[PDB]
Ligand code: HEC
Ligand SMILES: [Cl-]
Ligand SMILES: [Cl-]
Ligand SMILES: [Cl-]
Ligand SMILES: [Cl-]
Ligand code: NA
Ligand code: NA
């Protein structure tokens with residue numbers, strides 16, 4: 242799975258198993274993702290592309306296709322509770 246591979250290589254440092262070791266209240270599990278509206282590929286992809294706060298932008302680091310793939314992976318994992 243490309244999305245999983247991208248996640249392992251670029252996201253798992255902070256978000257292993259859907260957590261967030263940096264910002265406790267902003268993890269990738271169902272509750273926080275739903276509360277914050279990260280419930281579509283597009284919502285997730287927008288964040289990954291642009292960054293926010295202490296999370297880097299990935300729009301000049303990952304391709305559009307890679308961003309879509311990792312965003313779909315995160316969506317599916319979050320909706321099903323990692
Ligand atoms: C640590 C250096 C991080 C890496 C690597 C990635 N993310 Fe991240 N993410 C981080 C922080 C500090 C935050 C909070 C941003 C804020 O201030 O609100 C986030 C948030 C997310 C979210 C939203 C989670 C939520 O609101 O509950 C998503 C969907 C997310 N991060 C995805 C994501 C992906 C796919 C990454 C790899 C490309 C990635 N993050 C890397 C910190 C860090
Ligand atoms: Cl794939
Ligand atoms: Cl990768
Ligand atoms: Cl933070
Ligand atoms: Cl950045
Ligand atoms: Na890997
Ligand atoms: Na913290």
Ligand code: NA
Pocket residue numbers: 301302
């Ligand atoms: Na670049």
Ligand code: NA
Pocket residue numbers: 301
């Ligand atoms: Na940069």
